[PDB]
Nucleic acid binder design. Structure first.
Ligand SMILES: Nc1ncnc2c1ncn2[C@@H]1O[C@H](COP(=O)(O)OP(=O)(O)OP(O)(O)=S)[C@@H](O)[C@H]1O
Ligand SMILES: Nc1ncnc2c1ncn2[C@@H]1O[C@H](COP(=O)(O)OP(=O)(O)OP(O)(O)=S)[C@@H](O)[C@H]1O
Ligand SMILES: Nc1ncnc2c1ncn2[C@@H]1O[C@H](COP(=O)(O)OP(=O)(O)OP(O)(O)=S)[C@@H](O)[C@H]1O
Ligand SMILES: Nc1ncnc2c1ncn2[C@@H]1O[C@H](COP(=O)(O)OP(=O)(O)O)[C@@H](O)[C@H]1O
Ligand SMILES: Nc1ncnc2c1ncn2[C@@H]1O[C@H](COP(=O)(O)OP(=O)(O)O)[C@@H](O)[C@H]1O
Ligand SMILES: Nc1ncnc2c1ncn2[C@@H]1O[C@H](COP(=O)(O)OP(=O)(O)O)[C@@H](O)[C@H]1O
Ligand SMILES: [Mg+2]
Ligand SMILES: [Mg+2]
Ligand SMILES: [Mg+2]
Ligand SMILES: [Mg+2]
Lengths: 314, 301, 313, 296, 299, 298
DNA sequence: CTATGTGTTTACCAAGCGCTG
DNA sequence: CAGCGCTTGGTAAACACATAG
């Protein structure tokens, strides 16, 4: 079937309560005035639901949605904007940061004023025209808003940030995915899967799929809490969703170096790992959970790491 | 229908007083001797009123305005100059820094001497850009007037908010507009956007007059401080003060601790904190000042 | 070299094979394509071989490409649209060398199985969505930190290839000898595995060189002594230490007393730039427990004393 | 529009040698050898070429590098007389295919038509972009230097006479003091002061009116605008005058880093007010003294 | 002048011991030799070694350059290469990242891209240091070997062979001196022999005697250690101006009036090899050999 | 005009002896000379040396330039080369990364791809040995370096120029012209033809020493040969930076110059004459500029 | 083939802590 | 207590890559 089952309605959207509270007001005001929405920008870490929110907003407004990509697209964008746009329709550009700095400058006369500067003609007959565009809506989703030019960031009426989820919302997502796929999972098992998900919906769905694989191979029919725990232990995840490599890093830091300041290169060599791989894959979540610190003298293991690994704090 | 409610007169232009005095002197002098105005260049941070000022100047001079763009244009600019330009009219090129380095070489010889050999008429060029550094020095040296747009005081932003409310049909109070002006970041576009969001909140709530209290409620719902700081901007200072002691941190460590891209944390969030004096860029890293400490209700270091 | 085609023929990744077996069995049971899979680890461990073995176990075709081989997004679009089939596998070796624009075309392809391209070349330009078949993407890389995070989050299965023990390298050497007709013994295979640095490719190369040395001498069986003398001729310690590592340890022990020396002082005593001692020689000395990094400096471990035949500290 | 070497305003040191060279060329009845002129933009190199052309007594053919690779042959074989002068502005931008087509016609006189003899005057602002053969094929190399307040005052007086405006010598001198050693800047400032005085309604631009108009423009005695003073103030007061860096300084000034590097910085340098350290930008003691701040 | 047998090769005895083993085993198995990589300083005989290897196997040779190659590597691989033939690529580290990735399919699976079935062949690369090539490249070479600096006796033997092949009479001591002045390099020794022959020919003599060889070598400005006059000047401005302490970057060009160029790449390596310079962490220090060699009284 | 034999060549001793030996031996055994590489600062007369070598060898010349070269190497080595012909190349260090690799096969075994080539003596010329790759440097059998000229050699060169022109410069004045020359023959010739114009306009036929000194002073040259540009550089440094260390980013900007010719054509002479120092943190006036420019020491 | 403009990576270079005898 | 490491941050300068020409 489909492994990227996206909600169609803002009610099926799960856990962006603070964002949804303002989004409902904006959508209601726009629909009451019989006017298209303001240009909208969504940003945040991967896997939180920007691409799903774009489609949910398009369905809520009732308008047609045209989907484009940043890397897909300077002179082309003029043709797409002139030919493929209708009145009140939404144009969605994923990875809008990938637009070249030259291609974004064509959107300046098109987002605030609904016109476009086009030079039409050959040789001495060349002239300039202002091609009027229908009033539309632009939605952009990106992880790097700082790669967008300032005059373009200034033209977005609404800018919103996608925040992390809670274990209960991740459990709700797991339950919805199980119901749509056809797998019977208990609420406690879904909560256990959610607690090991790193506040991300894609991670929760992937973990549920792996647990389903384990249960199906084992011949089970209902993914009970204890069966889910056994499958997660087979996957090698702690109660914080901490893999074996992260636990190895913490153990090496606590034991071999005494938990004190070390540095990236020394710890990487002690772990037989590439320093960049470590600092870009394993370190960020250890920092987020409070199990690691980047002091000016080097990496330090906190008391949370000592209490989680079962060692006596110093 | 229209949200960029551009004024058409220099009297309706709000608050560029220091620039407006010189502009009035230049325009009156040019009109008195029946000669076209000198070539003019406007630059400054986004949202300050360069295009609006260009249109206002065109209206004040009483001549026609031909609007084009830098990205929209070497063999074209010659045709536009030789065919579409009347005598005494204005050619406005927006984002003029994007002009080709060959199309720029075909422009300044026609700007100094009005010959292309086609005898061009007397015309004035207006250029508006955010990056005058991309303009070649030969082209940059032919501009008779070069001006810089400055930020707006909260009272001028309040005047702009009241004008937008009057034109749209919304009823707002002067004290209500003062809060929106204070929370605006010295920019007119930001003030208009904040007024529109407060208007949406008030219309949904059913209120007919946006008093000061209702405006404050809407602004709190938007998540804005008295300094115009969003939640994402307050999180930076909170993480800096609490998780790092306020001392030097660095871009990479701060970005990792905030689950943020370093580039956006450096170019979208930090400039306004630095402008307000709530952040410092020490060579050892980023440091939270005493203003950031007492703004968030923390005891001084 | 001689690549196995069965997961039982694959030699020495047991914790990885335990996870992979249930994934493959469940994917085949549902008659569905496998998830996008990423293999990362140090070179020479068998990532390409594992990709081929996975393709054989699933029973589908395998289209092999490379990171630098895809210069433009048009190549990736053509491969994904024309060269692929439902359930097939596209293996991209060195996937961290893809350009960022080429990595960002893979997001819809891996998640939604669609693709965004622009066609028209001027005033007739337009955007279309190419609908892709349900395929499987396998990526092999040695630098997972060079992969963009949205791309790294789109992999259903992420696995790590670990170093082989001397016994598994001996098993690989014996398999290679049996396939090549040579009659090596258990002890010689164990010695060749110990001389290796936990890598299968190094073990195979050392076996080939020892085979040449034994063949020119007229011997029909590669006895342990012949392997020992051939490996001594190749210039390896009992731990596979080259002469440069030996003399680095000797300079650390004799000249500085084995105590903290520092990177700059040790490098200038060895006439080496501090970008070759740290990245080419230090990691293996630390791996074997012969070198120790301390805030004061670099310290030679007692194991380095016992290995070099020096009096204990 | 000067015609002779006496009408030229303020290149005295160069003019003394140029007069001798032209006199010798006339006495020998032989055309002058090739001449290369260096100098910052805005100093009047093309005007000097015209003056030389008139003084020698021959015609001038003004050309540039990016003016179109085979057109050089048509130029050199279609519009040259005996002893003619051919002027190429921006000679370092000449294409390579054209670059190895001119020096055969410089020394050997052979590249159509056989060129009898002529002289080439080349003007450029970037000597580093001229290859060694091109620099070695020029007989005379000369440098254009910046003007002085008195020479710029003379230029301002000439412009006022051309435009029908009346100025005193003191006002013209004050305008020329604030010019950045350039004639173009002096003319622009004179036009702005003319606008101010005409709007005021004064028949003669006295020194006091010129000073008032230049204060209304926001100019120091050094010619620094408000933005340059703001850059110095931000550098000194907010960063202690120490190294900062282009990005941090641009963020503090709310300015494009490229604009700050290319428009404002070059005049803060060349005046002793700024340095470009590998660790950032440092304000010198001259910046402290100019702004009325205590020494570091 | 190029030899054609490993016996005729002069002085790579340690490398030749293993090369004979690998070569004989490959010949006995009647299969192409594995890919080979040659390290070492320039001028030691890598191309001559490739020619000797090709003649020993009996197969032909297809010498190629590094920066010579994208669309021509496949052409030379398919057309000129029969069953296993040495394709020598000098300066393999200079390949662009366009044909480097096309080598691995041909090196391992012996097919390149339509897809063409390339025949079996052996590739011989050559660089100066292991670090000049990327790690993926230093993985498909079965044999990795290093060339060593020649001793004065081997250089003298090469000079004598060149003299015999040319028709010039030289005493053993003169050739030994010429080899001693050479920096352990065959091309340098051959060049010095040619210069000495040029100097001794105008004198009209028939035998290149040791004294004439020393006079000719002194004419070009070479001491007993083969140092150029620039190296002697550097040593002089080191000792007689600093006493053996750090030289300092500011004062390096004061006595040279030159950019910080060749001093960082042409002078220091040979001085360190000869032991005249030591890179003490405080700074560059001249050893006792520098003091004694420059005609100074012992300390 | 241009010297033909080595005796007519002015100065450049310690290089005309080795060259004499090599050319005599090459004549004796009758085969083309080995490939030669010439080093030295520009203006020392490398092309003249190539012409003298070709004339003494009794063969032709094929002077070309580096950045003029692709199959044009085959064209110029095919029809324009007789056996044992010199093919002097100027600025050989600026060869393209494509045609350079075709020079080696023409240099070892005299075959270029496909027709074979005769034996030819290629002569190169470049400023710095660091600009030419080691594989190319290894291809030249003979490598020599040109040195500067003493004031007497420049004086006699100026005398030869006067003889070819018709001027009667005295020995004591040509000596001063050579002294103010920066050890370069081209600079000496340029100064002589400037003094010629100055004396012609002054109304004189024989140029004594005092007249030459006055003409050189009016041209803008001091006793050390410094022009107005170098003195201006020193003045700007000393005044606007107190003689302190300044890198080649602020000094070039303050002089309205570029980081190009500056430190390439202007400053090397300043360091050579002990007027500038390349400090790790910048550039210093070395306290001799203060004495030369009449300023109090720091 | 060339040229600019942009995004990404990297090599000094300086500062701040902790130890040793 | 004042050299000797180690660790980190930022700043300028290269590289590589794309579009128009
Ligand atoms: N609030 C939500 N409710 C239900 N499913 C969700 C929600 N948010 C995300 N998902 C699902 O999580 C998966 C990933 O969501 P995406 O919207 O693709 O994340 P993303 O923000 O687009 O990540 P990128 O790589 O930055 S585009 C999809 O299968 C979605 O259906
Ligand atoms: N003085 C003013 N009075 C009223 N509205 C103004 C004024 N200045 C600016 N605005 C408004 O500010 C908004 C944006 O400013 P613009 O006039 O478009 O110039 P600009 O924003 O500086 O150009 P860019 O794209 O940001 S570089 C428009 O909606 C204008 O109406
Ligand atoms: N020294 C001068 N004396 C008299 N008139 C001058 C002088 N310099 C310039 N002019 C006048 O300036 C005009 C010529 O402009 P220039 O300054 O020569 O422009 P330019 O030399 O090409 O410099 P750029 O790089 O184009 S700004 C003519 O009207 C000249 O009369
Ligand atoms: N488990 C294994 N069993 C047998 N041979 C192996 C095994 N792992 C690796 N090899 C051999 O080692 C070599 C490793 O190279 P390869 O797997 O192609 O790529 P990588 O070196 O990136 O893993 C292969 O030639 C393969 O034949
Ligand atoms: N052992 C040797 N015996 C004879 N000649 C040698 C020897 N080693 C090197 N040479 C000479 O060196 C020349 C090329 O060697 P070298 O410069 O090392 O190769 P490359 O130029 O490929 O680096 C050959 O002409 C050869 O005559
Ligand atoms: N020693 C010399 N004797 C006579 N003339 C010389 C001498 N050296 C140089 N010249 C003159 O200089 C000219 C060559 O100068 P140039 O080409 O600038 O030097 P280079 O070839 O080193 O760049 C010749 O015309 C020649 O007349
Ligand atoms: Mg994205
Ligand atoms: Mg702009
Ligand atoms: Mg110019
Ligand atoms: Mg791989």
């Amino acid at each position: 079937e489909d492994l990227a089952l996206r909600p169609k309605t803002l009610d099926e959207y799960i856990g962006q309560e603070r964002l949804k509270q303002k989004l409902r007001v904006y959508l209601e005001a726009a629909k009451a005035r019989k006017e298209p929405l303001e240009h909208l920008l969504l940003f945040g870490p991967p896997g939180l639901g920007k691409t799903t929110l774009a489609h949910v907003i398009a369905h809520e407004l009732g308008v047609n949605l045209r989907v484009t990509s940043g890397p897909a697209i300077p002179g082309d964008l003029a043709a797409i904007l002139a030919n493929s746009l209708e009145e009140g329709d939404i144009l969605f550009i994923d990875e809008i940061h990938r637009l070249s700095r030259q291609a974004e400058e064509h959107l300046y006369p098109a987002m605030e004023d609904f016109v476009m500067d086009i030079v039409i003609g050959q040789g001495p007959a060349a002239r300039t025209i202002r091609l009027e565009l229908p009033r539309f809506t632009l939605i952009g989703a990106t992880t790097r808003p700082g790669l967008i030019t300032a005059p373009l960031l200034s033209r977005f009426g609404i800018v919103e940030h996608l925040e992390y989820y809670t274990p209960e919302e991740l459990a709700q997502g797991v339950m919805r995915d199980a119901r749509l796929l056809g797998v019977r999972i208990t609420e406690e098992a879904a909560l256990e899967i959610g607690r090991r998900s790193r506040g991300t919906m894609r991670v929760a769905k992937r973990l549920f799929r792996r647990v389903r694989d384990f249960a199906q191979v084992a011949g089970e029919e209902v993914i009970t809490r204890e069966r889910a725990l056994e499958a997660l232990a087979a996957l090698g995840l702690d109660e914080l969703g901490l893999e074996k490599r992260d636990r190895e890093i913490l153990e090496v830091l606590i034991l071999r170096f005494g938990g004190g300041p070390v540095g990236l290169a020394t710890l990487a060599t002690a772990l037989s790992e590439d320093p960049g791989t470590l600092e870009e894959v394993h370190e960020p979540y250890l920092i987020r959970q409070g199990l690691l610190k980047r002091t000016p003298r080097g990496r330090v293991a906190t008391e949370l790491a000592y209490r989680h690994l079962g060692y006596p704090p110093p």
